[PDB]
Design a protein around this ligand. Structure first.
Ligand SMILES: c1ccc([C@@H]2CCNC3(CCN(c4ncnc5[nH]cnc45)CC3)C2)cc1
Lengths: 337, 20
């Protein structure tokens, strides 16, 4: 039973939420191999844990850059939430620690690469391929939302493909535990719900709008609202108009009209029946929700694997030194990390 | 085509999030 499963998941989450794991490793315990990605205030590197020989993805955030970009509370949210969650499609945080200069989050390494890379290369995914990935996001949001968490940054760049072809959601930089409404303007332009652009209070319904954008992008090969500049994207989002490719099935279009819905009293995921309006939609008729959760469904794509520590499924980034200052930076700001 | 318009746009690469 869903209700019973989620109640037990909440008991587990709250114990970790109230007493977060802290300072569980040191930088000297890892061998730095290669950069897997970059952000405005950090980078993610492939590392090898010497004591086990295991490979991990280490996020390194520069404390001073976090402060300049006013991301202190968001970074504390990211680590506090990621250390407390447990779901098959959420990447696991193995260790976390900090030093004079940086914050570090050591997570499972997901070798298949970003959904973004595969989607851009192939062009678009078939409806059954997109449906397989979408079902995993639906279940993941059902789990997160039950814990009063809002994700706020769904996009292919943040969805990694594992060795079994299943999704691993990474990047909890904008996730927040909130019972009421929230107001921060954050996320990625193409994925913003109209209520975020219009500076209204908003809630978990923004994640369901973002799911509509993701499904559209996976099935079309391009997002529903795009332009050269963010301002033009915002005008398209608020207009109340969406065009679908002629190859989209009738069921796919109907599902998307209900997710990409400006009216909050009409948006799927936000009604009296909640997530069940999505799970029971015609486009998901062939989906066995339990088999997806149990990972019993055959994946439509298995990434190529040359062996342990291989990064062939990732783009190459410029390599920079990890400098650790002799003086502690921003100690007070990151005391709880 | 919409595909050709997307490919010729400046937003086919990795998209960064909004910051304050
Ligand atoms: C700050 C620095 C870097 C990122 C990048 C941006 C591009 N997407 C990414 C998503 C995670 N990423 C992982 N790759 C492999 N295994 C993982 N385990 C956890 N995260 C990853 C690849 C790069 C994060 C985000 C914020």
């Amino acid at each position: 039973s869903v209700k019973e499963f989620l109640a037990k998941a909440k008991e587990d989450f709250l114990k970790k939420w109230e007493n977060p794991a802290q300072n569980t490793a040191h930088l000297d315990q890892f061998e730095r191999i290669k950069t897997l990605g970059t952000g405005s205030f950090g980078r993610v590197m492939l590392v090898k844990h010497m004591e086990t020989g295991n490979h991990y993805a280490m996020k390194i955030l520069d404390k001073q850059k976090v402060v300049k970009l006013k991301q202190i509370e968001h970074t504390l949210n990211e680590k506090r939430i990621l250390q407390a969650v447990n779901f098959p499609f959420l990447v696991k945080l193995e260790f976390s620690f900090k030093d004079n200069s940086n914050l570090y989050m050591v997570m499972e390494y997901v070798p298949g690469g970003e959904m973004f890379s595969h989607l851009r290369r192939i062009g678009r995914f078939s409806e059954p391929h997109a449906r397989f990935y979408a079902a995993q996001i639906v279940l993941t949001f059902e789990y997160l939302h039950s814990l009063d968490l809002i994700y706020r940054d769904l996009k292919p760049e943040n969805l990694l493909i594992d060795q079994q072809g299943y999704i691993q959601v990474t990047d909890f930089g904008f996730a927040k535990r909130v019972k009421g409404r929230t107001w921060t303007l954050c996320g990625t332009p193409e994925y913003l719900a109209p209520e975020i652009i219009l500076s209204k209070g908003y809630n978990k319904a923004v994640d369901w709008w973002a799911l509509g954008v993701l499904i559209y992008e996976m099935a079309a090969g391009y997002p529903p609202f795009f332009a050269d500049q963010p301002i033009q994207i915002y005008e398209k989002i608020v207009s109340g108009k969406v065009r679908f490719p002629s190859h989209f099935s009738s069921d796919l279009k109907d599902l998307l009209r209900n997710l990409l819905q400006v009216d909050l009293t009409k948006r799927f995921g936000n009604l009296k029946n909640g997530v069940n309006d999505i799970k029971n939609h015609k486009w998901f008729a062939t989906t066995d929700w339990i088999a997806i959760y149990q990972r019993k469904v055959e994946a439509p794509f298995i990434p190529k694997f040359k062996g342990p520590g291989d990064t062939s499924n990732f783009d190459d980034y410029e390599e920079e030194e990890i400098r650790v200052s002799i003086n502690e930076k921003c100690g007070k700001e990151f005391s709880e990390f | 085509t919409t595909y050709a318009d997307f490919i010729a746009s400046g937003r086919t690469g990795r998209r960064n999030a909004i910051h304050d």
